[PDB]
Each structure stands twice: as structure tokens, then as C-alpha cells.
Design a binder for this molecule. Structure first.
Ligand SMILES: NC(=O)c1ccc[n+]([C@@H]2O[C@H](COP(=O)([O-])OP(=O)(O)OC[C@H]3O[C@@H](n4cnc5c(N)ncnc54)[C@H](O)[C@@H]3O)[C@@H](O)[C@H]2O)c1
Ligand SMILES: NC(=O)c1ccc[n+]([C@@H]2O[C@H](COP(=O)([O-])OP(=O)(O)OC[C@H]3O[C@@H](n4cnc5c(N)ncnc54)[C@H](O)[C@@H]3O)[C@@H](O)[C@H]2O)c1
Ligand SMILES: NC(=O)c1ccc[n+]([C@@H]2O[C@H](COP(=O)([O-])OP(=O)(O)OC[C@H]3O[C@@H](n4cnc5c(N)ncnc54)[C@H](O)[C@@H]3O)[C@@H](O)[C@H]2O)c1
Ligand SMILES: NC(=O)c1ccc[n+]([C@@H]2O[C@H](COP(=O)([O-])OP(=O)(O)OC[C@H]3O[C@@H](n4cnc5c(N)ncnc54)[C@H](O)[C@@H]3O)[C@@H](O)[C@H]2O)c1
Ligand SMILES: Nc1ncnc2[nH]cnc12
Ligand SMILES: Nc1ncnc2[nH]cnc12
Ligand SMILES: [K+]
Ligand SMILES: [K+]
Ligand SMILES: [K+]
Ligand SMILES: [K+]
Lengths: 460, 461, 464, 462
């Protein structure tokens, strides 16, 4: 077997040890192996996969394979691969192309290696994606391959937005399942995963004490909520910025001061609009928005000396890192940790005190400077992923008559019953015991004893 | 010579007015609507039957509706939830209100009846504001001819919405409704953070018990269960959580709570043997938050640790089997809304008996029964939504529509997201928070308008 | 119960049955105190003791009083604050035939009269021989006005930080006439009562007084000692954004590490007396200020003028002079919202507009807010403090300082704490009250760390 | 240039270590303040310090502060797993004798201490000792008493080392005076508590990447380390139970919101398996020892633990857990450095998919230093500022030069004055941007203090 490329195949044994541990931490995913192994619902599936090549993704990969699928895999970020996980998957005879520290060109090459087998397009029929890059490449560069694919399963918030924009424009070619908006994905991954892994990555990269220092979290969606908690629980004084007043209300009620980097919240492009008094007191800024340029050049110039800057959103344009590359001198402390000297562009004084510390070059800090979300959290997201692959593959969209395809081209979610069944396995993993309604109680609140227990409008 | 009211003590009116003036400073979203709409008088001609806890916060709501042109006739939706100084102030302002703290069940229904009838005949009502559905039920059961002239119902709480949706499903709902509960500035503000503030508040006022280091069991982990669990955990209780919904149970685990069931393996078969006696014997405090029936049953009550506190913060008292306790155990009143329940028998008690439970508010809503409910700055969000919902349905004029147009409009709906955000913005500004404004490039990048809405309707926050 | 008993003064004797019901509940919440009652009742270690008592006449103090009585003592009691009495507690004590002079809402004149009613019986000095005090007021009156009574008194047992400081000043000045036990500095007192008590009761009192939402609002806590630590937690756990002021850099360090921003009301921390030294921008953002220092004028007139409109002002230290309420009485108009809640209108002295927006809310007129606007610390916390009080009373009464020759007296004139072994035994009963299980050292383990299996487990230098 | 008087894992890591030292200096304002304050005075000129403490980046800033004030040093680590190899490299590259690397054997650990004691095969002309745990102190008293004759004092970092010093003093075997650095409030109530709060969950995440929220933890001990450890886990969402032999510390755990339990039925440890609360230990996902005592996670507790539980120790010595029992009876599978699965199915071999194992971190050694980087610089700032002030005080006292009659009056184990404790604290507070208020003269008079402090009596517990 030579159909792979990883950093060091001799790490496979180490990766396999950590995969065995992770399986014990992922009861929903392993429950799917046990219950669907007999049926083999993915027998004949040929999955193109593009998501962070972590130990957790390795357990997802081997679940798909255990249920009958063939896969070809790559990472969806240059810094997120765990090299021992990629080696373990390659050593199992599974095509994977990923290592930690890829270039932008190597990242694109890796995706192309899953798409192409022996210089020709693989006969893929299913797509698993995280962020929409593989989806984007298949639509623009390989649009004929999409005629054989039954569906796409997208993992993250940003990629779902890209899916919906394509549907509005009439450019989506196959059906997709929004895995993100399962409650066991969104309200488990996006929030709780960042709570675990944000402070984790900051400690590994800098070993800075967080207690008693000032943080500014930009955004208070699910990622901003978990991020703010990750810092507040360490004893940081956390301020939150938002453009959504409802999320801002939640931040107030959660015990945070809501501030704007700009005077009266008005970002008019001038240095005068920056609240320099506020930014001159901030020790740490974290972007969580999925928007562009929310930590902009004028903010970076006003930040307190020696502040830490990082991004836990999907793309590295939340921080204006291009401005910093253009104007300031970068000193690498260690991999994925750079001191950015605001004294000038060419050279720096090794003892200069006027610098910022940038983590992971503005890329996803939890995966770049640590190991991202823990297995027991990723268990929820990835159990949803397996179910969505099963559902789309059994639908067989690519084999439908043209008129039947037009009614099937949509972006749907999984039914709440499956969402609840994933949750039940996660609860049992904690040793929790769910109570069963009596028939009278179920009638009283208007549900079935079996569930679902909430209407589809419920927000939890 | 205004006499069209009944309250405990009208001489409390000046005190109530002092607290109303303070509360107004704490309710910027509600007072903003008052200032914004006062000239337009959008509720001129509205005649609102209101049934909701006659608190100081409800007083500000009432006087906002009146300031926008409405006439109202008011009662409380719970026998223990009224603040008599608030009722006095409303009555002294010439507004018909029938409510006092400590009503009997007969007085409770008499009070609702006094809003429905004026001078012994049906009032010319055309709007309903309700909390829990009791008024709504009486109208449908006893006054269908009045509903023919009513434009809509604005319902405050989860239990009342469920009752509306049952009527809609059965085809017995006679007028459209706005689900005020499911605004985010209500459900994820009032139901959650309101109970965070007021649950431990009511327990302290009722018992003055230290909570830190003691063991609590919260039944339910919806919005109220979430806020209640945090109310106890932030005080230092060791909180365990029960749930029938595995997604809510998942949240409780991830939020750092142990999830347990009162019943072995979660199976509630009705036998004493099914009770986890070891667990129940460790619990110092049980709080029910479900909106369900009999979630703290007789066998749990028998197995509870001696001197544990029992209370309910759901809408109705049947979450606890208090009927079993009246029938079997002797009740000793410590003070109003605080009773020791002696499990030694029904015929009297030893004053020094150690085997008792403490029941708060006789199982009625504990935060309102033993304290003052949610604070003004939280009820600001709920009641701003109520005002906007009243305006919307009154302006729709459902009762004046042809039969075919009524059929197209008979529904239970929520307010649009844009209103939800505008209520939130005034709440944030009340804290002194500063929302950031998107640039045109940023708004285009994420696909929203600069003024919002900022989230799809599917967003869960 | 005694026939014709009139030797008392309370608000409303008809509250007695309610008070008794709450005393019976509190007994179940105070296992260390009730354990002493059960362990020592037969021995009657306080038979012959005649105790002058001055401490907040709460339900918790009622359990302490009746423990001392159950061990053989006679007492005459008053409260140590004009607003801290629970009237149903005083009524139940009076109904039991125990002389008590206390009600909620005393004037300063009545407060002094109440202490004098304990000191006197039938117009003449009572033959007291023990003193239990909280804050030093009774101690001071005895030294200043009735020094001859101190000749027959065996000891003083002082409850709180402020009172201990007053005792230590007297000792170093040679004006202390009897030995004392510093009950405050038992760990089961200071690090339980002073910290955890305020955590429970500060937000309790603020809620009862104002019903204000605390989540999301800005608080300034002046001081970060034991009371300031517990107060800051009381507010932070509600979701307040809490800033902390301190003069002690070590306490300030703890505040930083505990997750609080440390700030001063004065620019660069320097109070030069002028309004220009006030950090007006900081104070104009504060919704709630709480004084916790035991010091004087730590929320001064210039701070009060700079506070954000409609801010809440309160004090949880022992004496009301932490806030400059005198200045507010001189210059601003007071509007009573309800008992122990006043709006203070900064528009002027004479009248006020009922809809004026420029006011502050003062709780308990600056007196101890937790006792003034709620019920102070809960029973299970006061268990620790008052168990120490009983043991201190037993130790000093059994020592019989007043019966010693003048030479032997000067050798034992001291302010002492109880030994750590007793501190530990009180803690053990508290832990058992929660259902906690303490592990027992093996002989090899106790030898390894150099302690006895039964303790004490820590050197006297240990800070916990 | 020509410097060979060291032994580190990899000298080429020096530039990386120097980069981290420069960052750490910006995080240690109290230590760097002492450098600026005393550089001209050179108060340690002539001091020759034997140092034995974790060779971390933070210790590097301490070492160079001592050198900047005039001292010469010879350094080693006090734990086989706690060295950061880039820190040791940076120190050796600056021409400072250091013998330390991560992952030493027991024989290498003792060899390293001996390399500081001896120079060119003979006793170095040492006159000061800086110790963390008492290992270097014990070797000097047992094996080099002639060297102690010329040593002016010992400055001891940690609780376990202080207890050993007090035992020597009690038995009349302590030969030179000592300063208990541990019991400065800016050490004990900063390092021991807040440091473990930061670095405990840090080390657990690095070693296992386990989700902690919603899982069950048992902390043995509720002293300073146990307090900070319990908070480290609780703030992550763990359901933390606490064990204690001290009822006062147990009272604090209760009031702090923890359930207090014992591994033994009714807390009675009689040596039998029957005494183990198996139902309690069968629900525990993580056990952490914090006591400084022996065998507080014994063999019967280990046999009863829930399958796949994590076992770690953050007290100074590994004997808090009965790891010797596990080496004799169970098969060890290394996951990665300082992470071992202990298979409870037998001693000879294991099934790679066996589910009945425990995960042991750092082989039972200090887990925060073993599996992460110990406490962060801004916390170690306080501890090491105290160390520098303690070295200055004892070196200036010149105990070794005093007559016998005067030595007897100074042979003691003391703490630093509270005024200095406060001066360290103020620099820490200023590092956060905190602003301390200055008492007026009337306010200082009212509470009976000098305006400049000290502000508390020596009995105050904070
Ligand atoms: N690193 C990870 O492990 C991880 C996991 C999940 C999601 N993500 C990524 O994180 C991002 C956020 O995801 P989410 O689920 O929280 O989405 P979300 O929509 O729930 O939250 C984003 C929030 O940012 C706010 N926002 C937008 N522009 C802003 C601005 N200029 N200033 C302040 N706030 C602003 C929005 O109002 C919104 O509340 C996405 O890119 C997603 O792909 C990362
Ligand atoms: N007291 C107040 O101030 C206040 C405020 C808002 C709502 N409420 C009332 O509280 C109740 C709950 O409202 P909500 O918004 O939280 O609703 P919700 O639907 O969000 O939560 C109720 C939860 O109870 C759970 N549950 C049902 N039966 C159960 C059982 N047998 N055991 C355990 N868990 C069980 C459900 O799974 C659900 O998650 C309603 O009656 C509502 O009207 C009271
Ligand atoms: N209300 C209650 O229930 C209760 C309970 C116990 C004690 N107390 C009282 O509270 C007060 C404090 O007691 P404690 O045990 O916390 O004492 P403490 O000595 O432990 O704390 C007081 C703190 O105030 C700080 N301080 C002094 N002057 C200051 C100033 N100008 N600005 C800022 N900080 C300043 C000191 O540095 C000190 O840390 C005393 O009066 C005590 O009697 C009240
Ligand atoms: N890893 C680190 O970074 C670090 C930092 C400081 C100290 N330490 C070490 O940690 C240890 C503890 O230090 P400390 O300052 O917390 O000491 P401490 O004296 O404050 O606390 C130890 C506690 O353990 C308790 N204990 C003793 N035997 C017990 C048993 N069998 N079961 C349960 N509890 C028991 C004692 O009652 C005491 O409260 C020492 O070895 C110290 O040197 C480590
Ligand atoms: N550990 C992980 N594996 C895969 N995708 C992730 N996204 C966040 N954390 C992740
Ligand atoms: N204060 C309050 N007023 C009215 N309704 C409420 N529901 C909960 N708290 C309330
Ligand atoms: K991970
Ligand atoms: K209220
Ligand atoms: K009380
Ligand atoms: K470190």
C-alpha cells in the first residue's frame, strides 16, 4: 500500500494506541458500529472526505469503513492534522493525504489526491466536507464528477452558509444534509468543544497565566459562548463584542460586559473610531465570528503591548493578518507561535517590548496550537455525520430520473428522533440515567413516551 | 368614587407607586415603547382581559397598555403571586384589578369572573392577555359569545402555549394567538435567567437555609430547569438533574451536572421498590421545573431525606403530589407559604418531630409565592413582547374578518425576529452595553442586512 | 413561661410561637451547637454563670442563648445593632423567661437603653460575671460607665473583627480589665462566618431590599478581607461584573487571581481630599458599591457625588461610618421606599421631585446590610461561630479570673484564641452536618507527616 | 567559549529557550523589579549558591536574577520529569553550570545533584543553598557536613521540604538556618493554590486530551494544593468530590460546594479490601493526590477504581500513589512519554484492546510539571521573588562567620517579614494593572497601621 502521503508513517503505532483510547470516549460513534455492522448500510459507498485529520476523525473514518464504505481523505486545514492519526489511518490501508504544517499549495494538492486516483477521477458517490473547500473544488473544477454523487454532508457553520448561498443561486448540484444544526452537533461541538479547547491551546502556545488578565471575545454565537466560558472559568475578566443584540443580551445576562472596539460601535474605517482606551487594556483577543476583518488593522495598532491575538473561527481572515505581514516583523517563538514586532517591517530588536503574540498565524487556534475538541465531544458531531451519510447514500439521488431530482435537491437536517438517539448514547457515556415518562405524563405534555420530546421550533 | 376593584389593602397604594417608579427605571424596553407609541395611541379602542401575576412588574405592563390607549380588567393567574402594594397602586389609579396574595381557589375564579363581567354582564372585551391559559379556558368553556368579538390572545408562558396548541389541534381554538413565550427575549431571558435570580431568592426568604454544600435534585432541564440548576449551583449546592429528554440531559452533563433518575434505571412503574432510596435519602432540596404532572410523586416524598425542602417553580402545583400529603400527613404552618409536613401521621404532630418535609408556597410557583418573582429588568423583555403582541393582534382585527379570512388567520404564531432583536437592543443598552454595527462589506460577507435580522429563523442561540 | 415575667422589652410578644417554630428548625441546622448542648447539659459547666450578652438578636442568637441556659447559665441580652434583631426571635426568648431588650428599628437612644437594661436589674447593677460581646459596645460601656462591675467578671468573649481590634488596643494601652478570648480568629469562625456568611447573605439582602437584577451590572466592593472576599463572591456568582478596591497588596493580589479587576476610587489611588482626585469615569459606571473594610469613610462624600445615577449603596462592615451617610443627611433629601430602603435625592436638601432620576438607593441607612435588609448569616454557618462562643464562655468561666490575687491576675490578663484541637472538633461536627466523611489517618501516615491520628493536623502557623 | 561545565539533553535548544526566557521576563515583574533594584548594589556578590529546583523557564529567570545580583550558582532539577530542555540549554549556553534534562533516571538524578556539589572532583566553595523538596539539603547533611560549615543558609521552596527542615531542627540535626519560602502568602496562597488551578487541568489535557466536563473526580486532600486542584477540575465542569483527614479543611470543601467523601467505609482504613467503598471508587473517572503524605491512593483503591480512570499525583513525591504495587502486579503500556496504561488483567503481557486499565500520568510524579510546564511565569514570579529576597537576607546574615554562641541564637527556620511579602504582592498587582488605594493618615491610624504597611497582624490568615 502506497496510496497516501503523511508526515511519518512510523507514528502509526502511536496513533493506533490513541485511537483505541478514543473509541472508549466515543460511545455514540461506537454504538453505530455495533448496530449497523450487520446491515453494512454503506456497502458500495465511495466517500470523498475533507475534515481535520485528527484522532477523532480517524474514529469517524474507521466507523464509515466498518459499515462498508471506501474513502479517500484529506484535512480541511493546514495546521489541524495530528500526524500520528494520519499515519495510523494510512497504515490501515486507507488513502489519506494530510500532515501538520501544510502550505496553501500542499493543502490544495492533498484535496486533489482524494479526488484523483491514478491520474483519473475516482468513482466517488458521496462527499463528507468541513468548511466547503472540497465542495467548492468539485463544483468549479470537477463538475462532471458531481453527476455520480448522491449527496454531501457538511460539518460546520461556515460551510453550511456556503451551501445555502449555492442553493439560492441555483448552483448546488446534489442534495446535502446540514449536520451542523443537529443539537448534538451545534450545541455540543460549537459551544462545549471550544470551552474545552480554547484555553487549552492558549496555555500550550504561551503558558501564560490567564487569571486576572483582560480578554476581549469578538462574537457570542455558539463558538463565542464556549470561548467566553473557556476564559472566564480560568479567572479572566472577559468583555464581549457583538453585532447581534440578542446574543449581546445573553452575554450581559451571562455576567459579561458588552463593549465595541469602536466608539459607539460605529466602524467608519478611521483610527479615530477606535476606542484606544479599551484596546490599550486588553491582554487577549479571540475572534469567533465567521465574519471578515473583525480584528482589523487599526485595532491591532491600538492593542496593549504583548497582547495575545488568536482566531477560533473557520477562516484566518477574521484577523487582518495580511496587514501584519505587510508592515510588521515576525519572530517565530516556536511552531504556530509568532511575536509580531510593531516597530517596523525589516528586522526587529530581540528585546523589543512592543510586540503582539499571534497564535497559529490566525488559523483555528484550538486545532493549530492544541488538539481541537475532545473525543467525547466530537462523538456527537461524528455520529450525526455517519447517520447523514447513511441516509443520503440510501436515497441514491444520482440514480433518480431528472424530474425526481428537482424535488430532491435541498439542504435538510436529520429528524429530531435521531438527534435525541445520539444524545441518549452521549448521556450514557457519562453514566447519566434518563427518566422514562409514564403514559399519563406523556399524554399530559402531548408527546410520545418514545419521543421526540420537543417541537422542531424548540431552541434548547 | 372608583369602586370597580378588589385588593387586600388600598392604603398600600403609595408604597406600590414608589416601587413602580423604581421599576420603570429598570424596564427600558417597556418604557421605550411607552414613549415611542404614546402619541400614536395604537391601543385606542382595545379592551384587554388580563390574567397574569399582579406584581410590580405587571403594574408597569398594565400602565403601558393604558398609556397606549387600552382599557383593561385585571386578575392574577396564581393565588400567591400578587404583590398587594402593586394591586393597590393599580386600583388607586382607577384600573379594575381583582387580586390579592393568599386567595382561596374560589376567590381566584371569582377574580377572573370579575374581569369578564362588568355590572353583571359580559364586558365588551376584544383582547386577551394570559399567563397559563386559565382565563383562555374559561372564555372558551363559558363565554363563547365573547370570543366572537375578541381579536386575539397573547400568552405568556410555556404551559399556556401548550394548551393553545391543543385547542388548535382539536379545532376548538376560537381566536388567533401570539406565543410570547418563544421570543428569545422571553424564553431565554425570563424562563432561564429569571429563575436563576429568583429561585434561590425564594428559598432563602422561606427557610433562610444555607445552600452551599447541600444536595439538590432539579427535575427537568428545559429553560426553567437550566436557570434553576444554575441558581442552586452558583450558591454552592451539589446539583443533580433529572430529565426525560436526552438532549436536555446531554446539556446538563456538558454543563457539569450529574444526571440521575428518581427511579432505578429510570423506570417509573408506580411501585415503592422502583424508588432509588439511597439517592432520595441524600437530597436536601428538590425543585420541579417540568410543566408536567406528578414529577415529585408520593413514593419520592416518602423516600426523601428528613427535613428536605420541596418546591415547584413550574406553572401548576400538580408537579408535586401535594394531595397525597394533605390526605396522609399533618401540616404545620411555620409562616405564610412555609409548611412543615410531618410524615409521622395525619392526626396531629409532635412539635419536636424530626421526620418532616418543608413545602414552600403549598407547591405553587415558589419564586412568586415566597419572593417577588423575576426582577424588573428581566420582565422588561417579556412585557415589551406582550405590548408588541397586543398591538399586532389588535391591529389585525381578526374578529372583524370574514369567515374565510378568519380560517386563514387562525393560528398560534411568534413575533418576527426583527422585533425580538429590537427588544434585546434596548435591554443591552440598559446594561450600558455597546453593540457593534456591521460594515457594508461585513454584512455582505455573512449575508445579512446591517440593521438585521442577523440570524435565520432556525437559529437556536 | 415564668409567672408574671416582665423583665424584657420586645416589639411584639405575639410573634413568640412563630419564633419558637423557627428556633426548632434552626436547632436541626446547628449540629455543633446542639452537640455541645447534648454533651455538656448533664455536667452543667455554666451553673452559676451570669452572662451579659450583646449580639444581633436573631434566631441564630436564640439558639446560642438557650444553649448557654441549658448548660446552667443565666443571661441578660441585647442586640448589637439597631436593625439586626428578628422580632420573632426576641419574642420567643422573652416568652421563655429570658431577659432580652431588642427590637428591629431601634433609635440610637433606645439602643443604649437596651444595653443598660441588661447591665441593670431592678435599678442596680446585676451581679454579672461573664460577658459575651459582638463589636465591643457592651465591653466599652462596662469599662467606661460601670468599671466596678468588671471586678466580678471572669472574661469577655468577643465575636467579630472590629471588636477584637478594640480589645487589642485596650490591652496595649493597659485599659483592659478582664481577660478575653478572640472567638473571631477560630478558623471555624473567621473563615466560615466572615467569608461564607456574607456570600450567602449579601445578595440576599440586596434582593430583599431592591429586587434588582444583579446579573450584567457593575459592582465595586471596597475591601477584600474575609468579608470582602465573601461579598465579592456573593455578587460575582450572580453574574455581576465586580471590581475590587484594597489598600493591602496581598489581599489585592488574591482579588486579581480570583478573577477580579482591582481599582481605586481615586486617581492613582491617592485621596488628596479634592473632587479632582475622584475617578469620575470609574464611579459613573458603578451600579452597586459595598463597603467591607471595618475602616472609616471608605465610601466618602466625593465618591457619593460621582456615583452613577440610581446606584445602590450599602455597608456590610460592622459600623455605619464606612459610608459618609452624615454628609447625605446634611445635603440631600431622603425618601423612604420601605423600612431600611431610602432613595437619596441628590437634587437638594429640602424637597424632592417624586420622579427625579438623580438619586441613590441606600440600604439599612448604612448599617450592616445583611442583618438590616435580610436575616444575616444562615443557621448552619452561625453554628461554627456560636459553638466557639460556648466553648470560650466555658473556658473563661471555669478559669475564675475575678477570684484570683492581684499578682495572679496580671499574669493571665490576655486576649487568646481557642486551641486548634477545639477548632478542629467544631469543624468535624459541621462536616458531619453536611453528611461529609472525614478520613482517619493510619498510624504510618500520621507518623509520616508528624501528627497524631486524632490531631491537631496543622501547625499553629497554618493559614488554610 | 570553552564552557563545558554542564550536562543537558540538547544544547542546540538554547536559542528557543532564550526566546521563551525573554517572554517570561515580561511576565515576572516582581522578579525583574528585584533585578533593577539590586543590580547596582550587587547584594549577592560573593554568594555561591547550590540550587536544586525544577529546571523550567521560570527557574531560568530566577537563576539569571541571582546571577545578575552577583551570585555564582551550580544548578540541578529536583524532579526527573520537570526540566524543560530548552530552558536548561539556554542556561548552559549562558555559561552557567546546570545538570538537568527531562526524563532522568534515578541514578542520573542523584548524579546531577552531585555535579553541583562537586567541582573538578572536590567540594565547590558553596556558601548558600536553594532547595525545593529537601533532597539537596538531605545529601549535604548526610554526606558533606564539612561543606555546611561554610554555608550561611538554606531557602526552601515547598511544603514537603519545610517539614523535613522542621524535623531536622526538632532532632537537633539542622546545621544551618533556613527561610521557609513556602509560607510567604505570595508563595503558599499563590503558587500552591492558584498555580495548581492553572496547571492541573493543563497537564491532564496534554496527557489524555480527555473531556473533563460532566465526569467524576476525586481529589485526595484540601490544603493549598488540594484547594487549587479541586478548582482546576470544577471550573472545567467536573463533579468533584474531596477527601480529607483535617476536618477544618473538610469544612472548607463543604462550604466551597464540594461533597466530602472517604475512599474507606466510615473513613476507617484498616488495610482490608472490605474497607474500600467500592461503589464510590467504581464511579470515579479521575483521582488526584495532593497531600504530601504516603499511600493516600493505595493498592486496594487502585483495584476498585472505575475502568479507564485517570490516576495522577500533584504532591511533591510519587509515593502518594502505590505505584510499586502496580509495577509488581500489572502490565504497563506506554501510550506516549509520561502516559502509561496500567492493565489490571495481569503482570505478563496485555491485550491491546483490553478495556480494564488505568491511565497513570508522569509515572506518579508531579503531574503539572511532568505532563505540562508547571505553574505559569506570572505565578512563579511571586515564589521566586521571595526566593531572591530570602537568599539576600541569609547571605547578608553570614551565619557561617558568626561565633558559636551567636550561631546558636540564629539557628532557626523563619519566614520573611510581612512587609516584604506585601512588597512582592504589590509588584504582582501592578503587573495585572491593578491600582491599590493609599490609606489617609487618619484611616491608617483608625485601623492601627503605617500607611506604607504592613497592614495585617502576623496572625492574619488571608
Ligand atoms: N474552531 C472550531 O473548533 C470551530 C467549531 C465550530 C465552528 N467554528 C467556526 O467558528 C465560526 C463561528 O461559528 P458559530 O457556530 O459560533 O456561528 P454563529 O452564527 O452561531 O456565531 C457567530 C457570531 O458572530 C457574530 N458576529 C458577526 N460579525 C461580528 C462582528 N463584526 N463583531 C462581533 N460579532 C460579530 C454574529 O452576530 C454571531 O452571533 C464559524 O466560522 C465556524 O465555522 C469553529
Ligand atoms: N416560575 C416562573 O417564573 C416560570 C417562568 C417561565 C416558565 N414557567 C413554567 O415552568 C414550566 C417549565 O417551562 P420551560 O420553559 O422550562 O419548559 P421546557 O419545555 O423548556 O422544559 C420542561 C422540561 O421538563 C422536562 N420533563 C418533563 N417531564 C419530566 C419528567 N417526568 N422528569 C424530568 N424532566 C421532565 C422536559 O423534557 C423539558 O425539558 C412551565 O410550566 C412554564 O409555564 C415558570
Ligand atoms: N456583616 C457581617 O455579617 C459581618 C461578619 C463579620 C465581620 N463583619 C465586619 O466586617 C468588617 C471587616 O471584617 P473582616 O473580617 O473582613 O476584616 P479583614 O481585616 O479581614 O478585612 C478588612 C479589609 O479592608 C481593607 N481595607 C481597609 N481600609 C481600606 C480602604 N480604605 N480601602 C480599601 N480597603 C480597605 C483591609 O486591607 C482589609 O483587608 C469588620 O467591621 C467586621 O466586624 C461583618
Ligand atoms: N505540584 C506543584 O506545583 C506543587 C506546588 C506546591 C506544593 N506542592 C506539594 O504538594 C503537597 C501538598 O502541599 P500543600 O501546600 O497543599 O500542603 P498542605 O499541608 O496545605 O495540604 C496537604 C493536605 O493533605 C491532607 N491530607 C493528609 N493526609 C491525607 C489523607 N490520607 N487523605 C486525605 N487528605 C490528607 C492534609 O490534611 C492537608 O490539608 C506537598 O508535597 C507540596 O510540596 C506541589
Ligand atoms: N478534534 C477534532 N477533530 C475533527 N474536527 C474537529 N473540529 C474541532 N475539533 C476537531
Ligand atoms: N415578577 C413577575 N411579574 C410577572 N410575571 C412574572 N413571572 C415571573 N416573574 C414575574
Ligand atoms: K482532541
Ligand atoms: K420582582
Ligand atoms: K439567618
Ligand atoms: K510554565
Amino acid at each position: 500500500f502506497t496510496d497516501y502521503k503523511v508526515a511519518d508513517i512510523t507514528l502509526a503505532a502511536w496513533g493506533r494506541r490513541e485511537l483505541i483510547i478514543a473509541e472508549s470516549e466515543m460511545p455514540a460513534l461506537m454504538g453505530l458500529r455495533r448496530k449497523y455492522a450487520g446491515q453494512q448500510p454503506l456497502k458500495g459507498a465511495k466517500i470523498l472526505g475533507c475534515i481535520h485529520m485528527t484522532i477523532q476523525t480517524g474514529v469517524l473514518i474507521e466507523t464509515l469503513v466498518a459499515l462498508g464504505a471506501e474513502v479517500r481523505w484529506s484535512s480541511c486545514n493546514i495546521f489541524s492534522t495530528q500526524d500520528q492519526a494520519a499515519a495510523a489511518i494510512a497504515a490501515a490501508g486507507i488513502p489519506v493525504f494530510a500532515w501538520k504544517g501544510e502550505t496553501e499549495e500542499e493543502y490544495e494538492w492533498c484535496i486533489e489526491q482524494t479526488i484523483l486516483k491514478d491520474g483519473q477521477p475516482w468513482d466517488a458517490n458521496m462527499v463528507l466536507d468541513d468548511g466547503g473547500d472540497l465542495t467548492e473544488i468539485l463544483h468549479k473544477k470537477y463538475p462532471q464528477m458531481l453527476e455520480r454523487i448522491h449527496g454531501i454532508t457538511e460539518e460546520t457553520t461556515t460551510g453550511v452558509h456556503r451551501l445555502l448561498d449555492m442553493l439560492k443561486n441555483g448552483t448546488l448540484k446534489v442534495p446535502a444534509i446540514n449536520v451542523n444544526d443537529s443539537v448534538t452537533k451545534s450545541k455540543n461541538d460549537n459551544k462545549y468543544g471550544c470551552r474545552h479547547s480554547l484555553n487549552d491551546a492558549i496555555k500550550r502556545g504561551t503558558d501564560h497565566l490567564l487569571s486576572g488578565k483582560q480578554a476581549l471575545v469578538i462574537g457570542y454565537g455558539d463558538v463565542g459562548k464556549g470561548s467566553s466560558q473557556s476564559l472566564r472559568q480560568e479567572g479572566m475578566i472577559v468583555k464581549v463584542a457583538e453585532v447581534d443584540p440578542i446574543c449581546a443580551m445573553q452575554a450581559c445576562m451571562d455576567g459579561f460586559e458588552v463593549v465595541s472596539p469602536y466608539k459607539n460601535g460605529i466602524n467608519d474605517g478611521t483610527e479615530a473610531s477606535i476606542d484606544a482606551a479599551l484596546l490599550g487594556k486588553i491582554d487577549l483577543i479571540v475572534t469567533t465570528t465567521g465574519n471578515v476583518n473583525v480584528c482589523d488593522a487599526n485595532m491591532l495598532k491600538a492593542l496593549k503591548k504583548r497582547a495575545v491575538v488568536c482566531n477560533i473561527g473557520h477562516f484566518d481572515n477574521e484577523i487582518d493578518t495580511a496587514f501584519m505581514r505587510k508592515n510588521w516583523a515576525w519572530e517565530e517563538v516556536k511552531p504556530q507561535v509568532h511575536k509580531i514586532h510593531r516597530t517596523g517591517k525589516d528586522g526587529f530588536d530581540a528585546h523589543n517590548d512592543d510586540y503582539l503574540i499571534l497564535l497559529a498565524e490566525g488559523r483555528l487556534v484550538n486545532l493549530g496550537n492544541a488538539t481541537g475538541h475532545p473525543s467525547r465531544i466530537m462523538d456527537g458531531s461524528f455520529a450525526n455525520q455517519v447517520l447523514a451519510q447513511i441516509h443520503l447514500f440510501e436515497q441514491k439521488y444520482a440514480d433518480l430520473p431528472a424530474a425526481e431530482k428537482a424535488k430532491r435537491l435541498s439542504v435538510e437536517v436529520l429528524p429530531k428522533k435521531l438527534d435525541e438517539e445520539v444524545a441518549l448514547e452521549m448521556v450514557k457515556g457519562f453514566g447519566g440515567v434518563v427518566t422514562q415518562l409514564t403514559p399519563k405524563q406523556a399524554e399530559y405534555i402531548g408527546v410520545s413516551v418514545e419521543g421526540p420530546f420537543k417541537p422542531d421550533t424548540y431552541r434548547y
